[PDB]
């Protein structure tokens, strides 16, 4: 389709430069500091999780038709008795692991759905707590450069 080649090249440029800037430490915007601190905290959460247990989502049997119900049950229980930044990192790590299992077991259709379920839960049920506890700036203060 008209213009698709040009647009894709622009996205490669943007993606390459953002990768290199964040790779060397430079956070050039606000959500850039949040993303970088979230990626780092997710890697640390996964490292601590694997040292104590088996890897995430092993023993979780996901299929496309049942995945939503499992996601909904895990996330509701994770935040049942409260929210804190550590549990929010767990929420992200869980979704990441769900997507990895999905691609690994050849259910790639689930990836963009899991992203929608996470964003919905994030906006509906975590953003009010986030706003009342300093916003994403506070998260960056607590987990950035880690």
């Amino acid at each position: 389709p008209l213009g698709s080649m040009s647009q894709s090249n622009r996205e490669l440029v943007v993606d390459f430069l953002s990768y290199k800037l964040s790779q060397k430490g430079y956070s050039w915007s606000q959500m850039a500091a949040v993303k970088q601190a979230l990626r780092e905290a997710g890697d640390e959460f996964e490292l601590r999780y694997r040292r104590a247990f088996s890897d995430l989502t092993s023993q979780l049997h996901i299929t496309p038709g049942t995945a939503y119900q499992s996601f909904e049950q895990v996330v509701n229980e994770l935040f049942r008795d409260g929210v804190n930044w550590g549990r929010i990192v767990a929420f992200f790590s869980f979704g990441g692991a769900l997507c990895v299992e999905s691609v690994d077991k050849e259910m790639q259709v689930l990836v963009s759905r899991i992203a929608a379920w996470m964003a919905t839960y994030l906006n509906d049920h975590l953003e009010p707590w986030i706003q009342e506890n300093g916003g994403w700036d506070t998260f960056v203060e607590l987990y950035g450069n880690n």
């Binding site: 023993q59 229980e77 994770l78």
Partner: peptide
Amino acid sequence: DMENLSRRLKVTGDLFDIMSG
């Protein structure tokens, strides 16, 4: 089995939350 998973996530999240302060 999904019961056990969210408990592992919650306790690991809380350990993280503590050590971040």
